[PDB]
Amino acid sequence: MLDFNIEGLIPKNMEKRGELVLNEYLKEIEDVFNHRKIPENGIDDEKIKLFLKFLSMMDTDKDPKSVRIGEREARTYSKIHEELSSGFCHGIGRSGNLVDPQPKASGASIMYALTNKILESFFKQLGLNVHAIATPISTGMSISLCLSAARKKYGSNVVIYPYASHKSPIKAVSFVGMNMRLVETVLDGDRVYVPVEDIENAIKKEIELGNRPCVLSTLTFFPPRNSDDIVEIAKICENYDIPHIINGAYAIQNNYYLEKLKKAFKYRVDAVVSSSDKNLLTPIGGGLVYSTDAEFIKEISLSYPGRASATPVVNTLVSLLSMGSKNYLELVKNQKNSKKLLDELLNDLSKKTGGKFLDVESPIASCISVNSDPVEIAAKLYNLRVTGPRGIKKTDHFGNCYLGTYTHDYIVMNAAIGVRTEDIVNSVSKLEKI
Amino acid sequence: MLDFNIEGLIPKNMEKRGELVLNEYLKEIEDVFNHRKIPENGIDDEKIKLFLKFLSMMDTDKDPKSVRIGEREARTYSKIHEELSSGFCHGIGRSGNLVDPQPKASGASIMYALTNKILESFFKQLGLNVHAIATPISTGMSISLCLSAARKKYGSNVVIYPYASHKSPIKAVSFVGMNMRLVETVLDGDRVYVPVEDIENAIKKEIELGNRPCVLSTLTFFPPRNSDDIVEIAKICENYDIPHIINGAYAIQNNYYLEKLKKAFKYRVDAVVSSSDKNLLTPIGGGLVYSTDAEFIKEISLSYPGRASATPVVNTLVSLLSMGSKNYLELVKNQKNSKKLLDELLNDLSKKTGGKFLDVESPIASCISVNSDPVEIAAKLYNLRVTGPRGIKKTDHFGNCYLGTYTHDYIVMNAAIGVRTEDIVNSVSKLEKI
Amino acid sequence: MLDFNIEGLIPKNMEKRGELVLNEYLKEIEDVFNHRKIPENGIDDEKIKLFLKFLSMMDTDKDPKSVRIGEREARTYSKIHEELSSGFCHGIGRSGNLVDPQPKASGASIMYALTNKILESFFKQLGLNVHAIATPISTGMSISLCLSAARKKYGSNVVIYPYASHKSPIKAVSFVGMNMRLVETVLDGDRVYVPVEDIENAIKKEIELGNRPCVLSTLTFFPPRNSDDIVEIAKICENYDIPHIINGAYAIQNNYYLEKLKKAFKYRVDAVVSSSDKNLLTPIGGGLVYSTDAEFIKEISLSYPGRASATPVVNTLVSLLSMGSKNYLELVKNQKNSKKLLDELLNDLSKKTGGKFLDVESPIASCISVNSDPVEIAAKLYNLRVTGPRGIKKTDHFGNCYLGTYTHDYIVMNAAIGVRTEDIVNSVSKLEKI
Amino acid sequence: MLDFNIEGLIPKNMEKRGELVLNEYLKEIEDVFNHRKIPENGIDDEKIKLFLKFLSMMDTDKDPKSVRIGEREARTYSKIHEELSSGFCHGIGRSGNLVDPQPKASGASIMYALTNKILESFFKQLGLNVHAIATPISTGMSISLCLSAARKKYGSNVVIYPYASHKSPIKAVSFVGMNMRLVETVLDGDRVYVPVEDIENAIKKEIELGNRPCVLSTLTFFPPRNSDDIVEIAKICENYDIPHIINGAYAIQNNYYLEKLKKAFKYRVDAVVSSSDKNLLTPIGGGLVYSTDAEFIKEISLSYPGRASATPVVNTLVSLLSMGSKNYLELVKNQKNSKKLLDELLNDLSKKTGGKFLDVESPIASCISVNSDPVEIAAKLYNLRVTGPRGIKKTDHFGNCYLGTYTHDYIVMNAAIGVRTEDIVNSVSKLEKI
């Protein structure tokens, strides 16, 4: 892989060992190029920087002999720029097409293509045979891309939306100027869900009126609400021959959701969208979009206007190469034990106060009831180093994802992938104190 | 600004001299916090990194004594992740609200607020008292933002678009799902433009249809195409009480463009969008949005679904601080000379060959007609490491930004900000060898 | 500790929390300055770099308002210079005085004073109440500094040297231009050693000749040879009032050696020299000199002609801060387990090989006698990726540190401070294949 | 140089282009390996780091498949360690032989060797065809290395030393434990010099009493003292067949001294020693030893006890690659222009008061006599942000390099290579305000 004139400096024996050593050290980098799969063992940072560097040197703006008189030559002022862009100053993709190789880049294009290959590989490790693409934008902004693709490929003009009250997906629908048709949730004990029956009727109504609907199902949401029946909805859509897009914000981190996706993929799921920071532990900013429909993923990368920053994509490529499949499946295992601990501990506090360890579906988050004002108990936690706890009032429509009155005033906590025991033990402790 | 126990280690005169030094060194950093203006002298990389680290250590996730049990606690896996994000793992803003401080960040919120004030300061220096926001997305996507803001603020549902053949802004309209009323260009010998009389006309038409027209004008585009009459368009939109958005990709780097803007703001201009890389020499992937109406900027910052990456915004702050006002003016002066050098050389090349040094409006690019296939000539140039020169056919509609048959086969070159003298000479020279 | 203007950008509650985070993040650095001892827990790389930056910013050459008209003003050319010196371009100390602060480098002088104070606390927690100095040169060169000192202070002109076959110390003696009185080792079963009796007779013979003897003993050496009776030699050097220098190459890591040191300091011991790399896992290049005589340590720092590089001294500080007292004890504890494993694996290997798990004093290394050429076996090992084991014929005089004929042909392996359970199991299995 | 599998990812023509850019970007690095000379143009820091990386990867500790159970595996605890050592954690040289390749580190050995060859092509370009070696220690310690080499190779046992009152070289002769015969200086106007006739009789006299004399002459020294008649001493040393070592601390930077060395090599010069910080804008800590005798360079190399840190040697390398020969010449020319600016300015201040502009030999330093206590003036300058000025009393024997009463109380200022105009103008106007 690497070879340079080193003769006449050291004796043959040392010369050969140095070469043997140099090749072995570079082996992990060489395999990525040759196998393009998520490595079993995580690769060290310095070795990944050397990898990104090998690709960054292939971009046009790195040529010392070229005469540059273009309109966007990608000149940068500070070195700090090269650090943040990882050397990919020309950003990613060609105008109006993300996954399309940029003639001025070349290095950035290979890293993008390699990153999607490895993402797809990662999915196969998890049991999902899909076509995947890392997106340089939020998951909500990524949903827009999907909504926009369906809108141009099938003609969608209205979105059937099983109620999921999160600012992102809601704003994504309005961002693309598409009409929404909500589908209220219903109460059932301590839960809230959306009857697949009402969705099918919403779909029928829209089709009766002359529209071409498409469903935006939601697979991962806060405790109160049940993951939608992705499988069922997926059948309906196939029967009606309508596009189905799934908001899988944090579906990739655990089996509970992966299985639903596996079974839903049997029928119609045009695309799934997932957060890269919630699932691959990447800093905020990027998304993962996957599906069994190669045709649809391409359209998705054709919805993005202009060129984008390569940084978020590189961050993903960095989670994949840095963690590796072993360490990932291990974080997933640690998740399970963290959750259980979170339950068989939060349930104990139910004995102390009034009680009632709510019985919700979430394989990540738990909920406990309380008398005091949730919002206040929450803020009282914010001011105790605790980050992430939610305090919802039974009268909090948006927070409960239920238009009527909810049955409890609670405090939900999460056991996301990568959560440390301390986050659990001590979050519960700071809780008892109130 | 910085203080720590140093006593009982070194003599007093050294202890004192030492403190004196640490203060002078930080002087540039604290001046940024105190004044919040673009400094006259560019600050060196090491100091900017320290400035960014200071802000970085204020973000929740860096609290060694914190407790995260949230659904999204910004846990990163690799240090590389911190480098790329520059320590802003949480990213920028709240969900669907870019410029609204993120409770879990703080340091990231400060940094962004500073970027925007340092951005405005920078604009003031250039002669424009405007409200500005650095966006974490491409200029095309930034236009989608502005469009979407026009939709929820003034209910606009149609975009009047004086023909400007560029994939990104065109897609930008399609993405937000708004119809487009195209206003073709007219040929005028060597120049191509869009009659203002026709734009107002298109305005009256769409209004008669019951729609609420919105104007997306183009101030900066390739040679054949003139800049749209931004000032006249702004008067019209003032009269009809109709929104006006201006695609001003590379308006900031040149005085010719800044002047029309200064005049245009005299009337109605809700927003102007510029590439952060074409003007602040940042890697591709950043945007600059500015306007005299603070109310519209707030709306623009509420159009982005979800939370965004912090990186492109940090690239913009690195440019302004690293660059400084002095150097920027120097860069601008050099383009004026580099341009005039380009003009005369090309004019010289003319005469010796078939001739004809096209007379176009652009202050950065120049053209010269040729009696051979333009695409083959540009090809040969590429074969000489000359990057950027375009070879357009008189029949290439998208190239000439004209839907008819242009009057010439030519080659265009640019004297973009940052161009070297050798580049102009080492370009017109090679073209002559052809 | 860190105060900069942040008002008028973020709401009060986020302002407050922002600070709580910032102070907490720096608490560890703040504690070093306040306590100046080895931290209980290790400090991460970023905090240490930050800590070192704070100190280097106090160096005269970093002063933007400085005025430098000297022949030696640390003008450096490349940023890499800064990185490698860690910001200490002036180095440490003054010409001929390492410990004496540099008026041109208050920062470099502070980190060095701190490094020495922190190093002394590291020792006290290992049970040694001493004055320690981190030296900018290897242990062999460090020994020269000691010998040079013993000459300035006591007029020493001859070194009685209990035979220890390591090229470094022997070359240290000749470098300082001092004659050497080599006290041959004697055989005793599987062990070789220098009888305290013949060391005394050597000493008294040099005094009879009218010379001022100096004793350079060796506490740490390869298995074949026992450690020198430091306690007796100290008892003797004292009665004869003669300087005693100890080569404690790798005595810091093993408590077996520390104990002998503790009991030997009750007598005559001017200084002990240890390698920073072998005990603190530092890159090769530095040393550690120490004793109960603050007077002798002062003279030692006045024996290095000219000014020294800062780097090796910083590498030693990084080790102390990076590890922490806690992590260190685990290393020492893990080494006890690795040695137990090694011995029981080698012992079992000898039962089925041809026998003989040699009886040697080494706490870190153990030997197995072989029935065939050792050099060959050690070469088969070397060829199998195993590095470090030595193969030694019963004839190799330098290798057995015995001028007579050693009773065995053997292989010796080490279980030094950072050895992994896998390497030992592995290296032994491969020894078995052979 | 670089070759990895990139097919089936990008269109072929782009694939070729990226491969061309990559190769062109690696040219400067490719040349260092093939040519092994200082490049006409300086190489940017990023490529220098990469170059160092290709080398560090060859060291035996970076080998992943290796089983480490040796006594000195070069294990490192912090990533900072690998940064301060530039990857060469095993240091440089074998035990007791610097320039000899270390079987444990082919990388460090390769780099060291390249550095010595590149250092040699730098001298050749300055007019000196010499054998050179970069050392990991101070020029003073480097002088001890030569003295030691002289002692072993030729049997020297007494240093003839023309008085050069600098703690460093004086300490070097003392360190090596050699008897020093001082040859006093004589007063002649504002100059102090060592008559060669005095030197020769000293040699003669030492030979007389059976001893074997070695001459340590000083070529570069503080203003008052003239440079020893290096050429004559060299001629004389050849006639007597006696070793000759020259202290050329800062001779490389000024042609005035290089011309003297050229004429001097025409006779007898065993070795010259120079500071790499004062001549190569390197951080403090490294030396440069050179001579036309390759046999003597090996001997010096065999004078260092043990293994050494690689950092000082990497610093020298970095300086040669970073500056380039073109820039080095611009530094040499700026200093001549800065020297004259220092003079005329000091002559002006001469008239402002009593003061006399002393007529000294120094091509880099110049002095102005003053009536008040020079030591109090040098102190005031310090307070006023000035480092480097010397304030010597007519009675200060060590400061004047003369055992009698010098004829002036004066202040010394330098215009060493790399000095800024601001340092010069501001240092004088600061002296003026006093």
Ligand SMILES: *Cc1c(COP(=O)(O)O)cnc(C)c1O
């Ligand atoms: C460069 C440019 C843009 C911006 O495109 P993005 O990829 O979104 O940065 C838009 N319009 C014109 C005319 C341009 O030249």
Ligand SMILES: *Cc1c(COP(=O)(O)O)cnc(C)c1O
């Ligand atoms: C986190 C999350 C998202 C993604 O939000 P972005 O800010 O766009 O990354 C979307 N939907 C749900 C239910 C989420 O929890």
Ligand SMILES: *Cc1c(COP(=O)(O)O)cnc(C)c1O
């Ligand atoms: C490691 C060691 C030395 C010192 O070697 P240097 O290369 O000078 O650091 C000296 N003696 C012994 C017994 C050693 O183990």
Ligand SMILES: *Cc1c(COP(=O)(O)O)cnc(C)c1O
């Ligand atoms: C500066 C100087 C020295 C000191 O060199 P070190 O690197 O500190 O050993 C020695 N001799 C002369 C003449 C000097 O000018």
